[PDB]
Amino acid sequence: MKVTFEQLKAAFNRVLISRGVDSETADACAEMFARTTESGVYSHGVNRFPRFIQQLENGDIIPDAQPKRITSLGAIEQWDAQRSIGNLTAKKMMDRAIELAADHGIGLVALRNANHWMRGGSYGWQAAEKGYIGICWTNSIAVMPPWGAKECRIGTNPLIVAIPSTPITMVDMSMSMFSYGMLEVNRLAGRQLPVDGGFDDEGNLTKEPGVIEKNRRILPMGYWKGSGMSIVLDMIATLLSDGASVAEVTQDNSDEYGISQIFIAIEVDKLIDGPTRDAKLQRIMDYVTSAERADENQAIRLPGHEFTTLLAENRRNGITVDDSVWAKIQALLE
Amino acid sequence: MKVTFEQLKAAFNRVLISRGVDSETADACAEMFARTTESGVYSHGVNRFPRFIQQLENGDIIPDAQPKRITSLGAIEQWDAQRSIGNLTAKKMMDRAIELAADHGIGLVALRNANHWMRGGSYGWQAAEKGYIGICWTNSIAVMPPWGAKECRIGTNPLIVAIPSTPITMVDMSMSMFSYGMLEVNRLAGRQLPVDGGFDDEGNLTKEPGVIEKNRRILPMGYWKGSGMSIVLDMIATLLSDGASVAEVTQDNSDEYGISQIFIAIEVDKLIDGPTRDAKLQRIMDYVTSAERADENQAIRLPGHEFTTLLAENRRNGITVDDSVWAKIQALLE
Ligand SMILES: NC(=O)c1ccc[n+]([C@@H]2O[C@H](COP(=O)([O-])OP(=O)(O)OC[C@H]3O[C@@H](n4cnc5c(N)ncnc54)[C@H](O)[C@@H]3O)[C@@H](O)[C@H]2O)c1
Ligand SMILES: NC(=O)c1ccc[n+]([C@@H]2O[C@H](COP(=O)([O-])OP(=O)(O)OC[C@H]3O[C@@H](n4cnc5c(N)ncnc54)[C@H](O)[C@@H]3O)[C@@H](O)[C@H]2O)c1
To answer: Which atom of ligand 2 sits closest to the CA of residue B305?
Structure first.
């Protein structure tokens, strides 16, 4: 289903408005959903709109709610989202971390009682766009089992690291090798994962999507390494925001809400000259892209670089959304 | 062979002093090399000493040199190691970060022209002991090919994240799923890796150490995830310190020296109560350890919790050092 930027935002807008969302907030929120899609992140863009709505109706989200600063230690700041909209509040918090970084060289915002921020890379991206290094992450509900377990007790806690290079180099990864969304994609397509992305009932690694989708034994990136990183990122987000951990949000809440997020912005230009920054960054990037390829036809790519090409493509060949997804959106009307 | 702490530290100090190292710094360095070894880290403790001394004699390391601060923006500072001792300087720099966080909430020190810091986890650990969150990483020579390549163009750039929990929770991990050191351990014992750790000559994943140690096609942790992470960690350390990147160090230097490192400390106690900190942190660790196991008799390990028993065991049955390694150290005094 081929659509337009305005059409997407239009839908997102009216749907929100009819759900007790003030036009202003609705528009702002609808804007981000449309932007995330046009950038190529449909999974957390148009595709996540439906699930985002139901949670709103469930009261997990409060459109009229707004962030509030609790404590200030200088370069670091603890805030309280107060169950506000995920993407909107996160975008503001990263902007805040940038302000703090502007006068401190580096800034950090710990957010508690927050909602799912959709695409994490959005916040790292808006920072890298301003010449700052961007680093952020959040915790979530227990959707993955720690290394050595068969029960889900840790979250996907995605880590984002964006660098103000040209083009922007950014890492936006789940702690789980594959996201449950990619599993469905492969399952529906009838293909298996390129690499082991889970465990079957016998406890053996597998590439079979369906098996993992059922037992929830999704494989952590780097096995024990991803598992470990997930836990430490949960502790840091929990501690600095004095908020809810993966355990708390899972065992105490009715769904995935009230999570904890971290936002970091780091000054760059006041530490390294423009010409030097470009030369040093360029040498790194070319050192990677000029390496002897494993597959000559397949060129080596840098992290996040696709978000620049994908965007350009949609702004030319138009945006295309999954029929089953679009059809669902239309349903939300009337 | 068994050796007492002081007997071990004496062998280090003796060699250090015989290599022109200052009496005070010598004792300081030997101390770290000993403590690291007593913590159960031999690969980067006593077994790396010979290599250390070799780079020292080659001029790579300047025992005299001391860290020189360059620029200060507030909570972030850029320092120049000036080819000083790796572990001794890294310790001071993390102490400077802890010093900055104490008054700004969060501190970061970007260091250029540094030397191998031995055990990265040492610094994250030292921060956590002070009650601060410890995060640090360094770059290295290109010893691993970026995802999609067969030629080494990226470094192992280890990321350390330590939490002031009880016990201290910490992830000290390289960006390579396995370290070349571990590949040798298995190969020598005719053992296959527990999980894929590299590619063969035909570009296929393999658990065969030998072939990997030969083509240097070591596998990045989490495939493209680790490869991407290594690249962004290198960019950050290079930019904030305006220092050498993996590419620069590998081609502009005669050996592994003049690398870039990042040291970060974040205060916790001023954002959360001691009891609330112990409770929330315990609820996280318990949520992990109480997970249904894949093997009923195999406990779920939390990252870094093995360093408490390794230390205790060594501080009761004496330290066990490889005999050939001990003789190689002694031989340096010949
Ligand atoms: N709870 C949450 O908030 C949550 C949880 C899981 C995932 N997510 C989001 O879902 C999205 C996808 O996450 P993912 O982990 O599946 O991402 P992914 O594996 O597709 O990519 C992770 C990173 O690796 C890079 N990459 C991918 N293929 C590459 C290749 N062939 N060569 C070089 N680099 C490559 C990408 O640019 C990216 O930065 C992200 O936006 C993530 O934030 C959110
Ligand atoms: N350039 C450098 O200076 C450099 C380069 C490479 C490695 N190193 C060092 O070598 C050492 C080893 O690194 P590595 O990546 O090979 O480590 P590793 O894979 O052995 O461990 C990484 C992490 O996973 C955890 N872990 C291991 N097994 C686990 C299990 N079964 N369950 C749960 N958690 C588990 C550990 O506690 C640790 O925090 C580190 O001290 C690292 O800093 C340094």
So the answer is: 37
